[PDB]
Amino acid sequence: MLRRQARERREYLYRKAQELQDSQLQQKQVDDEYAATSGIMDPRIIVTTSRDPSTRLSQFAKEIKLLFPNAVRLNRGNYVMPNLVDACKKSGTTDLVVLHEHRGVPTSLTISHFPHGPTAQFSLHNVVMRHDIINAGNQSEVNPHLIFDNFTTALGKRVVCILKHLFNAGPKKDSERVITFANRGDFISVRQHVYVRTREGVEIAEVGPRFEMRLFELRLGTLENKDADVEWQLRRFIRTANKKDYL
Amino acid sequence: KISDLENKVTVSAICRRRLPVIMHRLKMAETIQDAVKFIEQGHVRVGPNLINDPAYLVTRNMEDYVTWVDNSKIKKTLLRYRNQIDDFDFS
């Protein structure tokens, strides 16, 4: 069983190298991980948190669960990352979501794609939970419409391809629920709304939450594998960081 | 693809799938000649079945489960040097 995983990783690293060369030659479709299951099998998602999570972090995970139609929340009590990921792959899950916080303030968001990656880590800013909204009510859990704005670079498409597959395919045409991710200077503002088609336009209503996510690590492997080779990383001490844009 | 299939297929590719060739890649044996001796003596099992013929080619799905036989004196050596001989498993 370990031998099979070792072999598959080598094939995978070879595949991305071949895919990378093909793209570079084209420089002179859906990614290989998701091409097999794109639009065929709906995603299977687990959302969890760090050990001894604060009450707010548990609340935030529930909100992320409600965001994703096929998400299931799992308590991380004493689970070990190999033990977590192995237990996850057996059940057949597609993605794993793990959250961190600071004094009940969500801080980071990491997404790892099974069986073999990639793994993307995000940092959260201006997080506004729905529980902060009084008398808000319950969400709608229909398959929502997706909006991807200002993703231009090759990495931007990669971030799109990762994020896009977390949802179920083929939302019904008049679905009132829409999720939007707007890139603004590598800072993706995540918003979701419920709209009503009026006779003279569209009216939208926020249900919450609000948060800004920035990719800072994208790695060709599962989150457990701290040995895996890095596809891309965010350089902060470079002299051009204060004005460099990537997405 | 088919045009690849015309030229990709080679004798070396078929020889690569030879069980004597394979475990050498798996590092069970130093050398192909050491390998053919072991298989003839009957220490190497593919899945639940024992193979004594060197010319067997292992298909990919069976590639993972090629291994020694439980009561092999070789395996008894394997766990002995690393000091994990467990006599309940008789290996």
Partner: peptide, 19 residues
Amino acid sequence: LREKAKERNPDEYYHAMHS
């Protein structure tokens, strides 16, 4: 070295090991 440790074949056998 870490990668070698991960993808180690448990079935690998050697002769000088007999010593």
